[PDB]
Design a protein around this nucleic acid. Structure first.
Lengths: 656, 123, 82
DNA sequence: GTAAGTGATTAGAGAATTGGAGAGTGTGT
DNA sequence: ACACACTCTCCAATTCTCTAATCACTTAC
């Protein structure tokens, strides 16, 4: 077999520095390569040999840059390039590698794709394909178009999608989090060619519907590595301020190093001995405790817990993150992307979303659902944070009550499939559920922003009716407890749980305001449907269940690296049960006292002024008040009751 | 379907293979079978046909004759003759970069040239 | 095999031994709550070290918090609260 | 509206599947 | 002889299903 591939591959041409030189029978060589790839088996021998020889970087992209290239040569080059740039799981027909030997072939396919990405860091390639796109759409009328050029244009568009869906590469080196990614260089070349304006022009046309889903996928994959907070703030700098700032940063680093080293070298002591702690019992009979280092005081003793190996969970039940390569890019890249986002909102968004929502959930392919929810979340957060209030007309496809309805339906289906299935399939459905939850959170926050800051009372009334519908109907009010009771770390990421906590925080603030203004007094409930009085304390009491409070104590362990918003949300939810329902017995628990011990140890290293200046002072103060309330009436049986989670009758009998 | 997009029913002086290799890491590509056969053909042609400039004699055929007269089994080739315009400059390029792979092919070619002029040399 | 379980948690090394350890502990309510917490936490560690020496204090308290859901431990607590 | 009966939900126990630790034994220096 | 690696066996955790008891809703006076 592969002698045929080796004969075809080296017969194309050779790249001089700055010029590719071609042999006359490139056309027949490329035909033979396509023929072999069509006839390749499950071993994928011809495909792996093409990946070994690096056809895309060495030959095909420099060939496409040539000016003398005729129509058929360009056409068949694009055909072969699309087939080689197909993703790996698509080559493996959707099945993930279930076996030790299948994973080897998957990895061998994946590395060849990761190597090829730096070929597309040149604007000349995008300039070359932009002319063919312009010929079909702009320079040819709808009556006079050719199906051959139609298929070529479809291949070019799918090639752009396949290029932007390539993963990052670790082998080239490790790069810091505060500089331009390798993805950004492809973005710079893509935007400098100006092909994005043609893509926006195509997306604006109602007649050209079949390209719209792919164009949505392309713009989502461009914005893959960014967050709305990076682009929302307008970029400006002065180098005087930058120099002063960097000098202060290294001043912090130097002082930290000197203090830490002097503390460590002052810790050591010279000689030894061995000592008995009279009053503490040993394991063996009639024995006192014995130590073999000069301890300062008896409370410094640790019972040699440093030796003992920690118990691990089994491999099916450990928490897992999902990693997006996320960085603070340069001011140049951020300015270009900000301009692109504003142009998309002005020219494409309403038509594109309206064309997409009829089709995205009907299709066989899974990934466009994730792209749909991602683009919704990004655009709405960008509008709200940038305060570009005149753009609110342009996103009117997403403001209705129907948006909340359709989002809730899709989120419910994803949660049920992710809970009931097993394995990588369950993780795959849970990944969809995560993006749906984030889009729901942005819907809530955007409607509150419109109701607070819009200038037109008609727009305020339209937002207010939607907010009242969300507060009133049971499906929206029962959703957080429904998801929290089904959470499991085997099939859902930590990012999902953080997102769920923040969503619950914002929703409960909305319900509290609509009760406080008196707008919520009576509530419909299913039986037939009947109306009953609503009480906010009765609603808050649902979250005091043990199956909810487990995860709040679980996420409070990461306090030293959480964001300030997440720390505020966790402390606020505990503070409500502590001092609004006024029920501290449910929070008296050893696994929370461990978190308080860690926080106290962290705060020992700071002076009395720096403690009040610190960002963790809210958590410190809450721990102070709860521990004082605990020790106000300490008893030994209460200290025994702290070891177990306490139910309702347990709380009543402990209290009374 | 992507198969229907990518495949079609139409899929149902000769080229110098060696000159397109000039920039690669040659160790990885002289193991390609189509390259080894081409090098093996051209080195036999070089041994049979090379003329020293200003001379009418096939130098390496004369050297093989004087080697066979003494029953020796190694043949000395000049890198200058390999790298001149009448030699094979692709072989002279490839040789210092992958000598373990290249010398084996040249040994095989030299053996096949000797065994036709002198069939008794297997003894 | 060997593992911490309900027999050990209800046995003579268990909850009754922890109660006997805690009989001498009497914190001052007017003092620093974090200091009182530190004093309590190391008595928990001392009881855990005597009760099951193989494992860390953190994992011992996690295992006790897990084993509180068993019916045998619940029946023990129902008798013990009297 | 109140009391009694019946239905539904929740709690416990038994059985089966999955995974990981520990100890024993064999081989190589 | 001593160290290191590999294989086998057992036990514990989880989830489903069936049975029994307690609580709440419906019906009748």
């Amino acid at each position: 077999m592969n002698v045929l591939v080796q004969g075809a591959v080296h017969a194309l041409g050779y790249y001089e520095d700055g010029k590719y030189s071609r042999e006359p029978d490139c056309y027949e060589s490329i035909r033979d390569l396509i023929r072999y790839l069509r006839e390749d088996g499950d071993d994928h021998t011809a495909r792996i040999e093409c990946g070994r020889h690096n056809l895309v970087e060495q030959d095909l992209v420099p060939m496409v840059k040539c000016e003398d290239l005729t129509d058929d040569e360009f056409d068949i080059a694009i055909r072969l390039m699309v087939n080689l740039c197909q993703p790996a799981i698509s080559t493996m027909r959707g099945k993930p590698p279930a076996d030790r030997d299948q994973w080897k072939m998957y990895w061998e396919l994946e590395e060849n794709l990761r190597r090829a990405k730096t070929a597309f860091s040149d604007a000349h390639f995008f300039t070359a394909i932009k002319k063919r796109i312009d010929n079909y759409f702009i320079d040819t009328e709808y009556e006079d178009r050719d199906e051959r050029l139609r298929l070529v244009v479809e291949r070019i568009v799918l090639l752009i999608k396949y290029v932007f869906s390539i993963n990052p590469d670790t082998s080239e080196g490790r790069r810091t989090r505060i500089e331009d990614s390798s993805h950004d260089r492809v973005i710079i070349a893509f935007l400098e060619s100006g092909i994005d304006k043609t893509l926006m022009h195509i997306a604006n046309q109602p007649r050209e519907k079949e390209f719209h889903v792919t164009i949505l996928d392309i713009f989502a994959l461009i914005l893959k590595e960014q967050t709305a907070e990076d682009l929302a703030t307008k970029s400006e700098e002065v180098s005087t301020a930058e120099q002063k700032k960097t000098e202060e940063e290294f001043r912090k680093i130097i002082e930290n190093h000197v203090v830490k080293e002097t503390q460590k070298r002052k810790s050591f002591s010279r000689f030894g001995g061995s000592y008995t702690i009279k009053g503490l019992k040993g394991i063996s009979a009639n024995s006192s405790q014995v130590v073999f280092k000069p301890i300062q005081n008896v409370e410094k003793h640790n019972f040699l817990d440093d030796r003992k190996a920690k118990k691990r969970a089994p491999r099916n039940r450990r928490p897992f993150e999902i990693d997006t390569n996320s960085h603070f890019a340069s001011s140049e890249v951020r300015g270009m992307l900000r301009d692109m986002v504003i142009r998309i909102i002005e020219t494409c968004f309403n038509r594109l979303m309206k064309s997409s929502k009829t089709t995205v959930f009907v299709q066989v392919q899974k990934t466009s659902q994730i792209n749909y929810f991602f683009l919704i979340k990004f655009v709405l957060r960008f509008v709200r944070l940038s305060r570009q209030d005149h753009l609110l007309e342009r996103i009117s496809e997403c403001i209705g009550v129907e948006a909340f309805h359709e989002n809730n339906v899709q989120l419910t289906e994803y949660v049920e499939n992710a809970t009931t299935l097993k394995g990588v399939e369950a993780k795959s459905h849970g990944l969809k559920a995560q993006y749906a939850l984030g889009a729901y959170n942005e819907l809530v926050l955007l409607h509150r922003y419109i109701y607070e800051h819009a200038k037109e009372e008609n727009e305020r009334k339209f937002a207010k009716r939607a907010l009242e519908h969300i507060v009133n109907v049971e499906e929206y009010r029962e959703l957080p407890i429904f998801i929290i009771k089904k959470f499991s770390s085997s099939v859902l990421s930590n990012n999902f749980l953080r997102e769920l906590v923040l969503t619950t925080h914002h929703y409960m603030k909305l319900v509290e305001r609509f009760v406080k203004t008196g707008a919520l007094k009576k509530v419909t409930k299913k039986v037939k449907v009947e109306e009953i009085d609503f009480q906010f304390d009765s609603y808050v009491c649902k979250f005091s269940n043990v199956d909810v409070l487990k995860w709040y104590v679980f996420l409070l362990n990461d306090f030293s690296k959480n964001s300030t918003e997440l720390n505020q949300a966790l402390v606020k939810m505990l503070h409500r049960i502590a001092f609004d329902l006024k029920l501290p017995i449910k929070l008296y628990q050893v696994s929370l006292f461990q978190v308080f011990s860690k926080v106290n140890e962290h705060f020992t290293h700071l002076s009395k002024d720096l403690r009040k200046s610190s960002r963790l002072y809210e958590l410190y103060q809450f721990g102070f008040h709860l521990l004082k309330k605990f020790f106000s009436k300490f008893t030994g049986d209460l200290a025994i009751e702290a070891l177990f989670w306490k139910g309702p009758r347990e709380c009543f009998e402990i209290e009374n | 379907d992507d198969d229907a997009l990518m495949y079609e029913d139409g899929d149902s002086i000769p080229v110098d293979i060696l000159e397109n290799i000039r920039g690669r890491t040659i160790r990885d590509h002289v193991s390609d079978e189509a390259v080894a056969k081409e090098i093996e053909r051209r080195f036999k042609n070089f041994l049979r046909s090379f003329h020293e400039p200003g001379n009418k004699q096939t130098k390496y055929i004369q050297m093989i004759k004087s080697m066979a007269a003494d029953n020796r089994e190694s043949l000395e080739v000049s890198f200058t003759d390999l790298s001149d315009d009448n030699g094979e400059q692709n072989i002279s390029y490839f040789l210092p970069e992958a000598p373990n792979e290249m010398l084996a092919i040249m040994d095989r070619a030299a053996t096949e040239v000797v065994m036709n002029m002198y069939p008794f040399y297997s003894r | 095999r060997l593992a911490l379980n309900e027999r050990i948690l209800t046995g003579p090394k268990g909850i009754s031994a922890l109660r006997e350890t805690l009989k001498d502990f009497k914190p001052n309510p007017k003092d620093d709550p974090y200091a009182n917490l530190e004093k309590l936490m190391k008595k928990y560690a001392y009881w855990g070290h005597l009760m099951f020496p193989k494992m860390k204090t953190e994992d011992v308290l996690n295992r006790v918090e897990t084993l509180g859901t068993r019916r045998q431990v619940k029946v023990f607590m129902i008798k013990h609260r009297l």
